[PDB]
């Protein structure tokens, strides 16, 4: 997408020491969005094991 | 006045915690006294009793 624009400067440039050539220059700024793809994946979680310890005073 | 004292948790031994029983609650009371016996000391005068002490101060 388009964002903004800079100042437009008009210039005169000598050529072969005989003539002045008309020119101009500007900078136009755009927005963009870039997408890239990973090189792999991790393994899934198929099985989960959890250990539990319940501290109590009776034993 | 009656007094009641209950221990805190910090003062309960491990075996008491394991058995889940609280010890050492202390109470204190006082008791009245019915009257059983009484004694009296009478005195009889026949003549004129004599004048009493007249030291009308505040007894120290």
TrEMBL record, chain A:
<protein>
    <recommendedName>
        <fullName>Phage neck terminator protein gp12-like domain-containing protein</fullName>
    </recommendedName>
</protein>
TrEMBL record, chain B:
<protein>
    <submittedName>
        <fullName>Structural protein</fullName>
    </submittedName>
</protein>
């Amino acid at each position: 997408a388009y964002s903004s624009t800079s100042n437009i400067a008009r210039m005169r440039v000598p050529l072969n020491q005989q003539m002045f050539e008309n020119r101009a220059r500007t900078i136009v700024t755009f927005n963009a969005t870039f997408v890239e793809k990973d090189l792999g994946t991790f393994e899934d979680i198929e099985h989960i094991i959890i250990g539990i310890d319940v501290d109590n005073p009776s034993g | 006045d009656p007094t009641i004292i209950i221990p805190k948790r910090a003062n309960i031994p491990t075996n008491d915690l394991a058995a889940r029983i609280l010890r050492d609650v202390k109470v204190e009371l006082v008791y009245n006294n019915s009257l059983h016996y009484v004694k009296i000391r009478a005195s009889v005068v026949l003549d004129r009793p004599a004048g009493q002490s007249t030291n009308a101060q505040t007894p120290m």
